[PDB]
């Protein structure tokens, strides 16, 4: 594996539901890498993936790299109201020429930023009061073996 993930630090955690996701990514060592962040929600009859953002990085600097990946927040209107205040998942992945070779999964908890809202949640979700908590210390890493050059 020419490109290996060495570390991921979630920089702004916890944060507002609408704050961008900020990952400090460290990886080691001709075609561009593509870093992707994907929102994954599970409701009763539906498993839905929503790509939150992506960044093409290239030429790939060789050796040990450290950079920050800033991903746009989710669009709440594309998400069932049930998932806005529940446990969900984000997937941070990287692809080399469109074939994924590493995927880092994180649990995400979402809840209201005030005790009154947590105990008496309104009928309509107030996204501006939702705080997300990424379980950043326990990544679920999957690595895929793939050809480079």
């Amino acid at each position, epitope marked *: 594996s020419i490109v290996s993930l060495l570390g991921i630090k979630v920089l702004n955690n916890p944060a507002k539901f609408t704050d961008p996701y900020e990952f400090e990514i460290t990886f080691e060592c001709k075609h561009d890498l593509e870093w992707k962040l994907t929102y*994954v929600g599970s409701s009763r009859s539906l498993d839905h993936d929503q790509e939150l953002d992506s960044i093409l990085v290239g030429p790939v600097p060789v050796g040990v790299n450290k950079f920050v990946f800033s991903a746009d927040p989710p669009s709440a209107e594309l998400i069932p109201a049930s998932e806005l205040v529940s*446990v*969900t998942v984000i997937l941070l992945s990287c692809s080399y020429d469109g074939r994924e070779f590493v995927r880092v999964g994180y649990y995400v908890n979402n809840e209201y930023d005030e005790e009154e809202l947590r105990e008496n949640p309104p009928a309509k979700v107030q996204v501006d009061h939702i705080v997300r908590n990424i379980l950043a*210390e326990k990544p*679920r*890493v999957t690595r895929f073996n793939i050809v480079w050059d």
Partner: antibody, heavy 118, light 107 residues
Framework: SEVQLVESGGGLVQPGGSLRLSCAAS????????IHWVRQAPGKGLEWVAS????????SYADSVKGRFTISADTSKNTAYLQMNSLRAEDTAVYYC??????????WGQGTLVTVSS | IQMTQSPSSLSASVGDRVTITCRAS??????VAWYQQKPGKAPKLLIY???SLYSGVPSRFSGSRSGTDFTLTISSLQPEDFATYYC?????????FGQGTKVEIKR
């Protein structure tokens, strides 16, 4: 390149005693993956006991072993460990170590038997 | 933080369609995996993320999720399939296994 996990260190220990299990990894770096210990009492089901996660070395433990067991990983020796203190009879089981595959476990060792008895 | 697996034992024949279910505590499909175990051997991974087939596993194995119910289906039971099967939930703080399903041969 062949991926293998080999447990060692099992055997007979008295109640209240300590025992250090080893999980020798080959074919991958033990620090780039989550490593887990899962035990199986004679004739019983699977019971997870401990996990360690990459990058930070954060750990998770089942309630029945919290405090008594400590999981760790040494990158130079490419080996993970399960330090078991204050052992009890109910800790008798075959102990497997396994490698994390996302939220799952893709490679498992052969398991090492731990018997706690006087 | 609980997995209730059923049935606990099932007798079937080669070629049968077998359905094993686990009711989980959460509906996150990423967190659920299915394993097969034979006596004196380590468990083997069959299904991960509720419905993804692990490499090398035959296509007669499949997994699904309905609410908090997770189901493993074997479409055409083969002689090497008679074994015990376990579901797993890798939760926020604890990893939980189902009690297991022992699939035996009817005769």
């Amino acid at each position: 390149s062949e991926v293998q996990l080999v447990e060692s260190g099992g055997g007979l220990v008295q109640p209240g005693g300590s025992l250090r299990l080893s999980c020798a990894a080959s074919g991958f770096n033990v620090s780039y993956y989550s490593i887990h210990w899962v035990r199986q009492a004679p004739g019983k089901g699977l019971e997870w006991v401990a996990s360690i996660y990459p990058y930070y070395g954060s750990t998770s433990y089942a309630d029945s072993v919290k405090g008594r067991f400590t999981i760790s990983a040494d990158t130079s020796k490419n080996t993970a460990y399960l330090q078991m203190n204050s052992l009890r009879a109910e800790d008798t089981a075959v102990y497997y170590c396994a490698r994390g595959y996302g939220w799952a476990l893709d490679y498992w060792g052969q398991g090492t038997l731990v018997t706690v008895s006087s | 933080i609980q997995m209730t697996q059923s049935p606990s034992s099932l007798s079937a024949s080669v070629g049968d369609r077998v359905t094993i279910t686990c009711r989980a505590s959460q509906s996150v499909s990423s967190a659920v995996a299915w394993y097969q175990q034979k006596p004196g051997k380590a468990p083997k991974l069959l299904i991960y993320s509720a419905s993804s087939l692990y490499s090398g596993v035959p296509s007669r194995f499949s997994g699904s999720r309905s609410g908090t119910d997770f189901t493993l289906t074997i479409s055409s039971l083969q002689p090497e399939d008679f074994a015990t099967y376990y579901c797993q939930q890798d939760g926020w703080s604890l990893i939980t296994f189902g009690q297991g399903t022992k699939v035996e041969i009817k005769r």
